Amino acid sequence: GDIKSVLLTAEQIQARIAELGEQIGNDYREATTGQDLLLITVLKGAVLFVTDLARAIPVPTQFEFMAVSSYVRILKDLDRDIHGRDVLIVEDVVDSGLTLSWLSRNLTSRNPRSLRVCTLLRKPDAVHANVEIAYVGFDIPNDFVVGYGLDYDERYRDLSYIGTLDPR
Amino acid sequence: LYPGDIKSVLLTAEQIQARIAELGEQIGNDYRELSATTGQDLLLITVLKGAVLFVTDLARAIPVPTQFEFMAVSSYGVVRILKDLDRDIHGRDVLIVEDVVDSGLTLSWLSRNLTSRNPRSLRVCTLLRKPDAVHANVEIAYVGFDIPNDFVVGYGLDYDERYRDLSYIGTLDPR
Amino acid sequence: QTAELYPGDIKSVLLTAEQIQARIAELGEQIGNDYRETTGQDLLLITVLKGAVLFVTDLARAIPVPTQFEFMAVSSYSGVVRILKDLDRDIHGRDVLIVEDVVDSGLTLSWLSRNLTSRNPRSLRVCTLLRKPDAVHANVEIAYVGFDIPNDFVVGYGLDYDERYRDLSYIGTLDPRVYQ
Amino acid sequence: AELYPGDIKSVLLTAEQIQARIAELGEQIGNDYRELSATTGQDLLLITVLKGAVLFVTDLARAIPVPTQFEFMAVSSYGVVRILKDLDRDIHGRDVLIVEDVVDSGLTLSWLSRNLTSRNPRSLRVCTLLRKPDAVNVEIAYVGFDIPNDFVVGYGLDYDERYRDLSYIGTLDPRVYQ
């Protein structure tokens, strides 16, 4: 056991995503454009979240993945052009907002019809900064959490729940 | 969700989740005390992006520590790598996670590509297996379902990049 | 047989090998003088695969100041394109020169110039070997132009048709019967 | 003039030594693939890994008196190689010539040769500009120069991504490594 405590249980998470699904599914239930809602996720923290979210949204949703390295270095771009598409960014953790800031700028330059953000977790300097997120799963404290996509050196991702890693 | 598009339902969400829980248990037993011996978690390798739905559910269903590795590919058995693995799988216990194995051509390339990286072991787990896979030559240790030779959609599987978000798997009607 | 690589495929030679290497030598001197300057970091040459590869090699050797190589790979989804291979390094605060083979519509250069400026380099200029008359419709300014050529489709010295004729030392108009 | 004044301690291979060797290699390669180009109907394929052999492949291709096509690969290390950019087309049944710049331990070539042969090309040979003593695993058909195990720069070869634009190959002044 390397988990200090369980922050968000698997039952809580699945219950919240079901709520997010309908909230999203009714902001996007009209179709008019003839094109499905596009979910864009950066590998690979929100992979667990986007697979559950897409199944929880009661409207047709399509998948788009991105792989980005650091020196803002694109290691795998979008498969198709998102021009005139309704795009929903699916993140796992928004803390400083730097990651979201870069991604949103990059996607907006591709000229989408709309662009909104859906993160599973939001830390407490993301609330002080008053970032603009359309959909927030949970408001968590500023402690390093793992599980449900989140990781520490590529581990604990397979956890059905979200717990806090013990500061050794 | 897709009115009139799905002709007949092949596999309900309930049945899919039940089989994966069974697969997870079986895989967990075979790789029991592998993290205690080697000191490294079981490595799940998945090709984007049809089996992403399946690998997320499977990883949670396996009672041993597992990690994720993704590959983005394209076609010219002839496969172009758009995004390679992030790490070196040398000496790692590797499980290939596929969505559907039909001709086995996709699998025969991936098996060869990964075995050239010299992993400690390499096995395959596919959710769906079609009858033509019997003519393939890559051994599959874990099979979710044996289905007939019909085009199915849902749970990751698609047709013109649609129906992926479906919670179940079903056949398609002339669309 | 003959010494000709593609007999009967070239309608007319637009530019010869020596004429090409002579202009590049001139461009090198011109570029070298502009970037003779003060920051410690070398001039950065950025070209997309794989038409201006032949050109950037000779150009970098023709420029009398230190030059570094950067390569990008892209693939159309017209003016919109995906990145198959990004820069290996961050060009922030770097003096960057876009090395292109042919500028016609300008759609290629327009996206690249806009993309490279979002990385915020110290300076960003464009050098193309060839320029067609349709390039005047674009809005991205070009500092160095080796040759202004007609609208006709040309090959050689990197330029291709179905991945052929790239290895030619000269540039010529492809015979119409090849692409018809 | 000198692009890097006071950085090169000595010249190993002058620009004309290199270009002269390339002409010899081009003629030699051209005659080996003389008759097996008009039979298949497809040109000779040059495959090169970025970025060290870019200068060498552009000069070599123009030195080969038969039609030659280009293919570039971008890689990274984690013998063990990560592909950043793969080949543009399928090389099944093609006549492939691997164009390298330097073969030392032979690990890089060992991976590439294995990777390309899995794509089932008709023929697969190797041409490197430079070869080091510890390259005595995978057969090399064409070698430009046999050089000592010292660290050299120029003509594609770099140190911290510099000195690639040199027309010659030489050794570096010890103060550069500071």
Ligand SMILES: Nc1nc2c(ncn2C[C@@H](COCCP(=O)(O)O)OCCP(=O)(O)O)c(=O)[nH]1
């Ligand atoms: N696992 C985990 N990762 C965390 C956490 N906080 C930030 N990160 C890093 C970052 C996500 O890191 C995932 C990158 P991967 O490990 O390569 O998939 O989230 C910061 C959001 P910000 O840019 O708006 O500040 C955390 O609590 N748990």
Ligand SMILES: Nc1nc2c(ncn2C[C@@H](COCCP(=O)(O)O)OCCP(=O)(O)O)c(=O)[nH]1
């Ligand atoms: N949606 C769907 N896709 C199918 C099916 N059969 C093969 N594929 C193609 C493929 C799975 O679908 C991948 C679609 P992509 O991710 O958009 O490229 O599996 C081929 C296995 P093989 O190489 O052994 O023949 C099917 O029944 N439904």
Ligand SMILES: Nc1nc2c(ncn2C[C@H](COCCP(=O)(O)O)OCCP(=O)(O)O)c(=O)[nH]1
């Ligand atoms: N070989 C050849 N190619 C030409 C020509 N005109 C435009 N191109 C397309 C030229 C290269 O098109 C093929 C891409 P690659 O094979 O990777 O060089 O880029 C178009 C520039 P823009 O988007 O500003 O119009 C031509 O005359 N000959």
Ligand SMILES: Nc1nc2c(ncn2C[C@H](COCCP(=O)(O)O)OCCP(=O)(O)O)c(=O)[nH]1
């Ligand atoms: N500058 C320089 N680089 C050298 C030298 N030897 C190997 N290299 C690196 C050479 C190429 O390394 C990649 C660097 P780059 O080609 O600049 O992207 O590896 C081949 C060695 P092996 O065949 O044993 O795998 C050398 O003497 N000088």
Ligand SMILES: [Mg+2]
């Ligand atoms: Mg993330």
Ligand SMILES: [Mg+2]
């Ligand atoms: Mg598959």
Ligand SMILES: [Mg+2]
């Ligand atoms: Mg170009």
Ligand SMILES: [Mg+2]
């Ligand atoms: Mg090399």
Ligand SMILES: [Mg+2]
């Ligand atoms: Mg190097």
